[PDB]
Amino acid sequence: MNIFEMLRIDEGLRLKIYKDTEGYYTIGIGHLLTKSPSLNAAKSELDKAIGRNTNGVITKDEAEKLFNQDVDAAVRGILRNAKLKPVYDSLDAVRRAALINMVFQMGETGVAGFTNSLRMLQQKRWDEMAVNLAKSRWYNQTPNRAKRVITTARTGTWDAYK
Ligand SMILES: [Cl-]
Ligand SMILES: [Cl-]
Fold this sequence. Notes:
Keywords: Antimicrobial, Bacteriolytic enzyme, Cytolysis, Glycosidase, Host cell lysis by virus, Host cytoplasm, Hydrolase, Viral release from host cell. There is one protein chain. The chain is mostly helical. 62% of the residues lie in helices and 9% in strands. Helix 3 packs across helix 5 and helix 5 (93-106) packs antiparallel against helix 10.
């Protein structure tokens, strides 16, 4: 198990524009297109993203390309962020993957905002951190995905994904 396999499970794979769980236009493997209620605006973003006139449909290869770019952006976002970086550095390879998963899903600014859990994280207060992350919109909105990431963070094992 690695960060790629982890997110592939969490996000799934769709070759056609779709709406995330919050109503947003998405494609491939969890790649947000726009937060705009316009399908045309989504087909626009997609073509700009892909380099061509997709008529809203991409190939597996094209989805993997976006995915590669998105994991890379998540990792660089973490390392460049003053709040995220030290948490990251302080952790083990498994727990690190869980942070990257949260950043990919919620953006660097969003995760950076979890002040209290980042501190519990850094201090290794595992159980308490799991209880706190559960108290969130994120968990309430996507509970099954949240439980797996939170468990990964909590235990440092890939159990939830096996
Ligand atoms: Cl992009
Ligand atoms: Cl879910």
